[PDB]
Design an enzyme around this catalytic site. Structure first.
Site, short mmCIF file in Angstrom:
data_model
loop_
_atom_site.label_atom_id
_atom_site.label_comp_id
_atom_site.label_asym_id
_atom_site.label_seq_id
_atom_site.Cartn_x
_atom_site.Cartn_y
_atom_site.Cartn_z
N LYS A 75 27.02 49.11 65.47
CA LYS A 75 26.53 48.32 66.59
C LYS A 75 27.68 47.56 67.23
O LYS A 75 27.75 47.42 68.45
CB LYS A 75 25.45 47.35 66.12
CG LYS A 75 24.15 48.03 65.74
CD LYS A 75 23.06 47.01 65.42
CE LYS A 75 21.68 47.65 65.46
NZ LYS A 75 21.61 48.86 64.60
N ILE B 122 4.40 27.57 66.25
CA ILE B 122 4.04 28.97 66.49
C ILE B 122 5.06 29.88 65.82
O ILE B 122 6.22 29.93 66.23
CB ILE B 122 4.00 29.32 67.99
CG1 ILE B 122 3.01 28.43 68.74
CG2 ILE B 122 3.64 30.79 68.17
CD1 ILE B 122 2.81 28.84 70.19
N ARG C 239 19.97 19.75 73.07
CA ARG C 239 20.77 19.23 71.97
C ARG C 239 20.89 17.71 72.09
O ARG C 239 20.64 17.15 73.16
CB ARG C 239 22.17 19.84 71.99
CG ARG C 239 22.21 21.36 71.94
CD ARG C 239 22.00 21.86 70.53
NE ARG C 239 23.12 21.53 69.65
CZ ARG C 239 23.14 21.82 68.35
NH1 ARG C 239 22.10 22.45 67.80
NH2 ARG C 239 24.18 21.49 67.60
N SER D 113 23.41 18.55 60.53
CA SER D 113 24.63 18.76 61.29
C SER D 113 25.36 17.44 61.57
O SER D 113 26.59 17.42 61.70
CB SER D 113 24.32 19.48 62.61
OG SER D 113 23.46 18.69 63.42
N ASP E 139 17.90 14.35 60.87
CA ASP E 139 17.44 14.51 59.50
C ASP E 139 17.79 13.27 58.67
O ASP E 139 18.96 12.89 58.56
CB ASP E 139 18.06 15.77 58.89
CG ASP E 139 17.82 16.99 59.76
OD1 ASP E 139 16.66 17.42 59.87
OD2 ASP E 139 18.78 17.51 60.37
N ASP F 221 12.97 14.64 61.06
CA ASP F 221 12.46 14.95 59.74
C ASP F 221 12.92 13.85 58.80
O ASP F 221 14.08 13.45 58.82
CB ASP F 221 13.03 16.29 59.24
CG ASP F 221 12.67 17.46 60.15
OD1 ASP F 221 11.48 17.59 60.51
OD2 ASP F 221 13.58 18.24 60.51
MG LIG Z 1 19.09 18.91 61.94
MG LIG Z 2 15.57 18.85 60.99
#
Ligand SMILES: [Mg+2]
Ligand SMILES: [Mg+2]
Length: 325
Positions: free
Chosen positions: A63, A97, A140, A171, A183, A247
């Site tokens: 590929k 979804i 972002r 991140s 997070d 989160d």
């Molecule tokens: Mg994150």
């Molecule tokens: Mg997260």
DNA sequence: CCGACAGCGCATCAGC
DNA sequence: GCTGATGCGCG
DNA sequence: GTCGG
């Protein structure tokens, strides 16, 4: 991004396999190849060159030869032209979804953003919120905003109980100049692997953040994991900030290092590391690293730092900023 | 060849 | 109601 | 789809 074209191609194939084919191992195979190529410090001149890399086999090598030669991939050109595949891929971009719901929706003739919007009653709670903030969740988060957000969360947590420790992971902890979401790893001395000396530890924090209008919506919420939406406050006459995904994970305090290792990622880094652990005869989760006996996990090994975990599996320590795989 | 591929929290559902 | 499977999500 | 044994 010396090999941006190739890594984009592989990621698109990965997503097709996950969302449309529902072939998760093919999805992981493509993402591993993409990741190993992303970190390869040379501009790839051929498939043969790429095949030298672990995770790149014959099929992907071919590929890559097609891509280098023509600047495209016929397989992907076709996938793009296919309406069912294109619709399914789009719908899965809504949080809540997945591949199954997406295919079911397309079946019922629900296949565009407009469709979702007029069939809100066919969505569960998570999906409704994902739809509500579809645009915002696309964007972002500049590190500068992440810092403002950290300030709010850490200060509000401290206001509830000065004994909480909140740590921003993902991140952000890896030093990224922009993040997909926030997070937060939470600990409190009343919650260890030995006992929970008080309930609602996570709830109290969630409630406080709602009180100050930082948390705006909840996708899901349990005793140890919150998944929701938040928003920075804006000043007078200023346009509002986009809503952001947040989160929050409450981890037994004595298991902080396994927890922070997990929540720091990246996701591919974690998969590589846990896989390596298995090869070395250990199993790693966000709580513990345990030896494998019959192949049964033994008791948790003592851990006093992230590095201890690396030491067990005989990897040299890698700083968060070098875990962006 | 072919077994294995990381590990787990919360929401939803079927079956009882 | 509970249990187990499955979907979806987190790294 | 790729890899180790
Ligand atoms: Mg994150
Ligand atoms: Mg997260």
């Amino acid at each position: 991004t010396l090999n941006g074209g190739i890594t984009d191609m592989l990621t698109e194939l990965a997503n097709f396999e996950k969302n449309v084919s529902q072939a998760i191992h093919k999805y992981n195979a493509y993402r591993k190849a993409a990741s190993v190529i992303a970190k390869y410090p040379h501009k790839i001149k051929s498939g043969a060159e790429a095949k030298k890399l672990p995770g790149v086999g014959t099929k992907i090598a071919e590929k890559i030869d097609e891509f280098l030669a023509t600047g495209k991939l016929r397989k992907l050109e076709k996938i793009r032209q296919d309406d069912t595949s294109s619709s399914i891929n789009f719908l899965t971009r809504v949080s809540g979804i997945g591949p199954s719901a997406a295919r079911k929706f397309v079946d019922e003739g629900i296949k565009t953003l407009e469709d979702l919007r007029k069939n809100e009653d066919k969505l569960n709670h998570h999906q409704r919120i994902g739809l509500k903030y579809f645009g915002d969740f696309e964007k972002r988060i500049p590190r500068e905003e992440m810092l403002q957000m950290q300030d709010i969360v850490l200060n509000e947590v401290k206001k509830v109980d000065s004994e909480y420790i909140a740590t921003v992971c993902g991140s952000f902890r890896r030093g990224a100049e922009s993040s997909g979401d926030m997070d937060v790893l939470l600990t409190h001395p009343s919650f260890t692997s030995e006992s929970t000396k008080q309930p609602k530890l996570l709830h109290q924090v969630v409630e406080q953040l709602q009180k100050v209008h930082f948390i705006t919506d909840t996708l899901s919420k349990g005793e140890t994991k919150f998944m929701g939406v938040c928003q920075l406050p804006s000043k007078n006459d200023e346009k509002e900030y986009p809503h952001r995904r947040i989160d929050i994970r409450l981890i037994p305090k004595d298991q902080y290092y396994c927890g922070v290792l997990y929540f720091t990622g990246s996701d591919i880094f974690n998969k590589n590391m846990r896989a390596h652990a298995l090869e070395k005869g250990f199993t790693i989760n966000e709580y513990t690293i345990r030896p494998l006996g019959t192949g049964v996990a033994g008791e948790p090994l003592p851990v006093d730092s992230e590095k201890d975990i690396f030491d067990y599996i005989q990897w040299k320590y890698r700083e968060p900023k070098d875990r962006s795989e």
